[PDB]
Amino acid sequence: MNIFEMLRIDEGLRLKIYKDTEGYYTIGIGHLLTKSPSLNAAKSELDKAIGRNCNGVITKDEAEKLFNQDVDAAVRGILRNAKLKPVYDSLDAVRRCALINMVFQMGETGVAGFTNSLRMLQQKRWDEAAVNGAKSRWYNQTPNRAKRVITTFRTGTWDAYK
Interface residues with Cl ion (CB under 5 A)?
Answer: 135, 142, 144-145
Bridge partners, 26 (sequence order) = 18, 32
Of 12 and 86, nearer to Cl ion (C-beta) is 12
How far is 162 from 159, CA to CA, in rounded Å?
Answer: 5
Q: Is 132 annotated as a binding residue?
A: yes
Q: How many CB atoms lie within 10 A of CB 25?
A: 23
Confirm whether residue 79 is marked as ligand binding: no
Active-site annotation, residues: 11, 20
* CB atoms near residue 43 (< 10 Å): 20
Closer of 48 and 135 to Cl ion (Cβ): 135
Least distance from C-beta 64 to Cl ion, angstroms?
A: 23
Residue placing its CB nearer to Cl ion in the complex, 54 or 150: 150
For residue 90, say whether it is annotated as part of any ligand binding site.
no
In terms of Cβ atoms closer than 10 Å to its own Cβ (0-12, 13-18, 19+), residue 117 is buried
Q: How far is the CB of 148 from Cl ion (least distance, A)?
A: 8
